[PDB]
Amino acid sequence: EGRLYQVEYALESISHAGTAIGIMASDGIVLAAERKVTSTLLEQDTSTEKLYKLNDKIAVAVAGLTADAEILINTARIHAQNYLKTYNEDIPVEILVRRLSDIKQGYTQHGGLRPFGVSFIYAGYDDRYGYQLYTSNPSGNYTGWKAISVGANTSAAQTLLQMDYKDDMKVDDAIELALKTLSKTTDSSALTYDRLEFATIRKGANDGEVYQKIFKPQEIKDILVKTGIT
Template sequence: MSRRYDSRTTIFSPEGRLYQVEYAQEAISMAGTAIGILSTEGVVLACEKKVTSKLLDNDGSAEKLYVINDNMICAVAGMTADASILVNNARVNAQSYLKTYNEEIPCEILIKRVCDIKQGYTQHGGLRPFGVSFLYAGYDDRYQFQLFTSNPSGNYSGWKATSIGANNSAAQTLLKKDYKDDLSLKEACELAIKVLSKTMDSSNLNSEKLEFATLSLSKINPGQVIHKIWKDSDIDSLIKESGVLDDKNTDDD
């Protein structure tokens, strides 16, 4: 039945659905899991890394984590080529706002501008939706630390903890169970590791399979935002400290 309505982005089905948008969302559900957790001290983004080849040299750069400006970072799930286009657009918008008003762009305004572009690609013939979802971690003076997610339709929403990509339902269930409003940044990092260890199709969790980033305030310079994309050694240390591997071995026994 859907064949009559999925040949164009702009054709609605009798139920009012856009099948091309749903196809894009289905493609994202096959991508690696990405998790975002809001804490009292900052925001954590953690992603499952899909290693295509051990021979690939990426110079230690992250595949699914991007720095947008001094106050925002993001994680993606889906087509990284589409993500690069939207990330570059977000960076240009952020710098344009900074140049015009001499202050960093508020998080939600920037996200809304990117989502306007995503929504536009669902309503014009000859275009296709962007096949990527985002997790945005940001900070501004009015709302402090914030976590947003957006999908190919152009919808966006704020969260305390959420996930996108594969095993999304299982990750959401675990986050609902273990999330608390007073989590410290360290506790949020450990929770992210715990959730990924239970949702990823892997018996051995290590830095080769994970990407990690945090957004927090400097303790030395008040008001200065620090975004950190973690090195492999830092991720391995966190996994060891969290005791996830010990718990996993106990479960297997």
């Protein structure tokens, strides 16, 4: 047949995991993930749910078993820092996503293991190719994108990206389109500021380094007061 049935079901697994978006800019990258329907008693700043920081200059927006993803996230940190210790210089986003996407095929190569049920939208910056946005899935393939989604309702999200995305837009324009996308692909009756996570990458404070903030729930309110509803 030329198919793998566990791997088609691992792709069906990430299709249960809630919707996640990532959009590039002409100078930066954005990430925007939905937390699905959740109990009132869950904590809201201690819960490491969808987004993470893999070195000074790379993030991830994950959909899957978070438990699987944690090990890959940790190995990306270890590899990135060991690269930075090897070359005294930053790890490119593509080398990092290659290394993690190998592992996710290396288990898929095999009968002694299940493959990891995790998709990974990566944002990062380097002095190879500037800002890079990557996407990677349970079989271990990877692809670069300008604007992409993973997890549940991936297709409905890419139908909202397809016609609206204009190639030149800035970071703070993409912060609109992430919420236009997520709210149209919402898995809940409506959004609230605690139900989503965001992280961004920008060219330093101004020149030199890179700026790499995670939005805390008030900063998430601050981007919702804008591009919101009436």
